[PDB]
């Protein structure tokens, strides 16, 4: 299917830091792409958690230099929460796409078939995640914004300051 384009407007410590534009692989992983797209628009409203099914206002809570930036936990904000629009967890749709380099967009999980709303953007090639995380898009603009967020990560995963998805949505 035609490929959706979505964006995040990022703040770092409250400071406007630019836009990350992403292309989703609707044609390869439609269920996975459709979940992320709707979480960018917020169109499915309040989820089972009672919080909005929406990345807006959420943070990259886990950021590791030379690895990736991870976000999508809008229910607990710490890596233990998050919710897909389908309502809890859904199976890995396929592993056709691989972690080929910086910019790759892929699902975070807790093992096989545990996709929620958490995701990461790779800042390096992470071949060791192939077949274990579902890859469903890539950055096409704003890789420099991804690097700026990455600069605030630590080996420990804890960010130096709040890296927020201040706005987000779908481009037509
Ligand atoms: Au993994």
Curated annotation (Swiss-Prot):
UniProt xrefs under CDD domains: cyclophilin_ABH_like (cd01926)
GO biological process, one term: protein folding
Organism: Caenorhabditis elegans
Keyword Isomerase belongs to the record: yes
Superkingdom as given in the UniProt entry: Eukaryota
Enzyme Commission code: 5.2.1.8
Keywords: Isomerase, Rotamase
PROSITE patterns reported for this sequence: CSA_PPIASE_1, CSA_PPIASE_2
Tissue specificity annotation: Exclusively expressed in the single anterior excretory cell.
A single cellular component GO annotation: cytoplasm
Gene Ontology molecular function: any one: peptidyl-prolyl cis-trans isomerase activity
InterPro entries: Cyclophilin-like_dom_sf, Cyclophilin-type_PPIase, Cyclophilin-type_PPIase_CS, Cyclophilin-type_PPIase_dom
Gene, per the UniProt record: cyn-3
Chaperone listed as a keyword: no
Catalytic reaction annotation: [protein]-peptidylproline (omega=180) = [protein]-peptidylproline (omega=0)
Protein name: Peptidyl-prolyl cis-trans isomerase 3
Residue span(s) of domain PPIase cyclophilin-type: 7-170
Family: Belongs to the cyclophilin-type PPIase family.
The protein's role, per its UniProt record: Catalyzes the cis-trans isomerization of proline imidic peptide bonds in oligopeptides. Plays a role in protein folding, transport and assembly.
Positions in coiled-coil regions: none
């Amino acid at each position: 299917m035609s490929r959706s384009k979505v964006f995040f407007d990022i703040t770092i410590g409250g400071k406007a830091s630019g836009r990350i534009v992403m292309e989703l692989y609707d044609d390869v992983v439609p269920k996975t792409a459709g979940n992320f797209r709707a979480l960018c628009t917020g169109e499915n409203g309040i989820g089972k958690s009672g919080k909005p099914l929406h990345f807006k206002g959420s943070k990259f809570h886990r950021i590791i230099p030379n690895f990736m930036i991870q976000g999508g936990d809008f229910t607990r904000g710490n890596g233990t929460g998050g919710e897909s629009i389908y309502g809890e967890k859904f199976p890995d749709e396929n592993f056709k796409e691989k972690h080929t380099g910086p910019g790759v967009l892929s699902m975070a999980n807790a093992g096989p078939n545990t996709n929620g709303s958490q995701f990461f953007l790779c800042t390096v090639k992470t071949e060791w995640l192939d077949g274990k995380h579902v890859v469903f898009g890539r950055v096409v603009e704003g890789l420099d914004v991804v690097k700026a967020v990455e600069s605030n990560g630590s080996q420990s995963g804890k960010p130096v300051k709040d890296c927020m998805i201040a706005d987000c949505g779908q481009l037509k």
